[PDB]
Amino acid sequence: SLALHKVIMVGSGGVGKSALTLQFMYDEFVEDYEPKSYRKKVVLDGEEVQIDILDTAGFRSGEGFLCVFSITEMESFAATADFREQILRVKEDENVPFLLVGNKSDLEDKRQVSVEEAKNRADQWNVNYVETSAKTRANVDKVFFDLMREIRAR
């Protein structure tokens, strides 16, 4: 019986929740692909564990949350506040494993949310901010592993 870390993908429509999930799961990225709980056995810091990712459309059983927004849409960034508030209430826990993810970092020329703005919010919530790209793979494994580490340590 291996540890099972339950991760939940949250965020506005189109931010890349599915793309991130599929890149992490199968190392595949197909632009314009609109997809089905995904499971995968991985080694976290020397320990084989199982990660379970719930990729919902833009929640109580979840142990950790990846709060995703697109750096190219400030609207999706603004929306993270509601998602944040909703998670804490439903989960009743204020220190729930949470990570703010700014996806689509490869679309820098279309950025609407600066790194400093996102970081400010992350610091305000006492969580980390990581920018990812399902397309270039940049930091995708990092956000899932980092979140599992959060879950691992309560």
Ligand SMILES: Nc1nc2c(ncn2[C@@H]2O[C@H](COP(=O)(O)OP(=O)(O)NP(=O)(O)O)[C@@H](O)[C@H]2O)c(=O)[nH]1
């Ligand atoms: N260039 C680029 N495109 C991305 C990235 N992540 C996702 N996309 C693209 O953005 C679009 C929406 O991604 P998708 O994963 O479907 O978003 P979602 O958050 O899962 N949408 P929904 O909430 O409706 O389920 C797709 O055409 C996808 O290829 C990224 O990092 N870079």
Ligand SMILES: [Mg+2]
């Ligand atoms: Mg999706």
Ligand SMILES: [Mg+2]
């Ligand atoms: Mg960059």
